[PDB]
Amino acid sequence: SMSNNSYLRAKVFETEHGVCQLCNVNAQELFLRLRDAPKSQRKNLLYATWTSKLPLEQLNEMIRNPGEGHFWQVDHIKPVYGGGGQCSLDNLQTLCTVCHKERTARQAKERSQVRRQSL
Ligand SMILES: [Zn+2]
């Protein structure tokens, strides 16, 4: 279970410091830069880098008030087909939000494929 999310984020951060383990962006460093930029500079910063691939809805929230969870998430290293898996620390990793969303979107298709193959 990932429900104990604060705890898990902080434990993974002790080792990974908000660096995506798939694409190696330093998502925490971008968070801090955005947080401390004036709102009026945030849009151009976000569209100049890997965050440009996030949903417009999320990017609008990030311009108003960025939070750490907009930039990186903890997720499984070995997920089950369709999502889930063991939530022990040795099966967890930092993903930037763009990688996390690709993974989530893939797992929703996988859940589709599972439902299909059993109808
Ligand atoms: Zn990434």
Side-chain angles (χ1 to χ4, degrees):
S1 169
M2 302 293 279
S3 77
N4 193 22
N5 215 261
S6 289
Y7 169 71
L8 292 176
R9 287 174 68 84
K11 290 299 303 189
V12 171
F13 189 88
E14 283 176 16
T15 291
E16 291 181 355
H17 309 287
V19 180
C20 180
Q21 297 302 290
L22 302 186
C23 76
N24 303 308
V25 300
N26 188 332
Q28 178 75 9
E29 162 178 74
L30 190 63
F31 165 63
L32 296 165
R33 172 90 170 101
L34 269 124
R35 184 190 70 199
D36 291 339
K39 168 180 169 130
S40 69
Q41 296 173 16
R42 294 187 171 145
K43 184 187 189 150
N44 287 337
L45 291 170
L46 289 165
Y47 283 89
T49 196
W50 60 263
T51 42
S52 69
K53 289 183 167 207
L54 290 162
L56 175 60
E57 174 69 29
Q58 183 165 335
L59 295 172
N60 287 340
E61 287 174 22
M62 291 160 87
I63 290 159
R64 177 166 350 105
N65 181 32
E68 294 88 338
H70 292 140
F71 293 80
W72 62 272
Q73 289 291 323
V74 176
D75 206 338
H76 298 111
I77 298 163
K78 313 198 206 234
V80 178
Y81 197 76
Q86 292 305 289
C87 296
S88 59
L89 195 73
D90 64 35
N91 196 34
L92 299 184
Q93 74 184 151
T94 302
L95 297 184
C96 73
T97 41
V98 166
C99 291
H100 182 239
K101 285 180 200 290
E102 293 166 13
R103 175 140 306 172
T104 292
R106 189 171 39 73
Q107 295 174 342
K109 300 324 193 60
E110 291 167 0
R111 282 186 317 266
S112 264
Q113 176 78 334
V114 169
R115 273 182 318 262
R116 177 193 347 287
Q117 78 199 171
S118 74
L119 180 148

